[PDB]
Amino acid sequence: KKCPELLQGLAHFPETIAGSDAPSLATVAGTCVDHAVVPPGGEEPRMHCAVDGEWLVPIGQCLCQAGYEKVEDACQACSPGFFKFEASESPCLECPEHTLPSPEGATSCECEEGFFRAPQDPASMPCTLVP
């Protein structure tokens, strides 16, 4: 009748007592691991501890922020040559066509000289020849 410390959905959950009559006690809020956040329109992670001592599947999750990707239960900076411009479930993406190699932890790859990205387009957009 005790649920253990857990990492789940890029959130840390504390040790909790099992068999509590109060939903404030048996269900606990997880705290995001480093460089993970709850998206603007997302549910904050919460997990229920059952009477038998086993965690249920959590509701909600944290997501790795821009420039980071989930590796196991951690958020790790994108490798050079990769990028990630938003907090999302997605891995880092390889730089698109006509960009220059990015540093570690980048949110975009810079256009090759003579190429451009329109401001309306996302960072995943490949760069196009300047007319």
């Epitope: 040559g81 006509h98 220059l100």
Partner: antibody, heavy 115, light 111 residues
Framework: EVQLVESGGGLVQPGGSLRLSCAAS????????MHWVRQAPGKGLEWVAS????????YYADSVKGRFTISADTSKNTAYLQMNSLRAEDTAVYYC????????WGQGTLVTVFN | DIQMTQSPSSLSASVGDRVTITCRAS??????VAWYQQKPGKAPKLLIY???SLYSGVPSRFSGSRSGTDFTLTISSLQPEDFATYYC????????????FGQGTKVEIKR
Amino acid sequence: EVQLVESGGGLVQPGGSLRLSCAASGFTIYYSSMHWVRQAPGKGLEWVASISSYYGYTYYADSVKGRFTISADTSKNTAYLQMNSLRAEDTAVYYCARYYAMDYWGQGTLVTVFN
Amino acid sequence: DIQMTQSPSSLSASVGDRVTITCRASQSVSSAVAWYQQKPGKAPKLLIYSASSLYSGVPSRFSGSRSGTDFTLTISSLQPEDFATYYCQQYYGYGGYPITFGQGTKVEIKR
């Protein structure tokens, strides 16, 4: 662990066709770029073709344009190289590999054009 | 195609030696350069990417550097497992342009 398993190589007459497969596990192929690189016996490495289903492009070495077609089925997590109008110069071990800086490689499959 | 001119085509060395392999790009390729090792009967193995980033699991005796269009792979202390062929590669533009490889450098045992 990431793994790329190739198949489909073998013996083909000139003008014939083969289809190579590159089955990926341990990652989602849609989020990667995949590449075919070939090595003729006793020679170096030569890029053949690239694909990104994420960006929606295919690119080809001049030497194979108009003859080979690179494709993928993301629902099978597999990449393909359709090789038509084969030539003696195409004989090589064909590798599939992940990303422009190719971090994982298939085990290779030998393509032998024979008369 | 941007050419990668790799030198030397071969070299003989002893275990413990410092070894340098150099590749000159025919025009600027930014830092879009990788280095690979290959042994007979095996697929190539990525050592260095983005000109100087060490790939995970590759020992720190391997390093890469860039000066303009010149790229060098240095092995600070050659190990028995390092006798192999080495290739540079450029991927400038990440698809904008043909990917090309150096012609390779065979690192052999001196005796």
